[PDB]
Nucleic acid binder design. Sequence first.
DNA 1: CGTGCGGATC
DNA 2: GATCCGCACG
Length: 65
Amino acid sequence: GSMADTRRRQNHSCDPCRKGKRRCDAPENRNEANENGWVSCSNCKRWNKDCTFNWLSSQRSKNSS
DNA sequence: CGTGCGGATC
DNA sequence: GATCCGCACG
Ligand SMILES: [Zn+2]
Ligand SMILES: [Zn+2]
């Protein structure tokens, strides 16, 4: 496309991952993960951060554009 | 067992 | 703003 052949868009990372600059497991089903019992991707893990895709599911979902 | 950082390209 | 990616140390 344009920037899809270099990186990004593989599984969208956590809040702390975007700010820590790190890819991870917590995918588009991180929620369904908690459902099947998730915990914390490799990031939130090493830094006991906050594996979150919630504020996210409501952060990017809100507002227009 | 945590710790952070430069970049693709819009 | 977003996601991807590794790595070298104690
Ligand atoms: Zn993550
Ligand atoms: Zn996480």
